[PDB]
Predict the structure of Bromodomain adjacent to zinc finger domain protein 2B.
Amino acid sequence: SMSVKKPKRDDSKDLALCSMILTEMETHEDAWPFLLPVNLKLVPGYKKVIKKPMDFSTIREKLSSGQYPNLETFALDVRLVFDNCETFNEDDSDIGRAGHNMRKYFEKKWTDTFK
């Protein structure tokens, strides 16, 4: 509360570490469904159904331009990418499996880097 603070967690490397994680996600072989924004002209249903589209390139640009105030807002957008994928794709599809795999990959890197 006012003039009562928990000890200051060092957050000075967060930006670099989120960039590193994002690089590892970008270079995973199953990243291909997530690298670029879904083409809203070419994919029926996407625009109406997925209220907040997110992809790795968009996260990368937000990251690079100081649009994440903290590491939780970064994780929210990453998870949004996988939540959107599960919303739109069957579990038993290449893309559906890609999303589960990438989410797993991300969550491990996240825990190992920060928790």
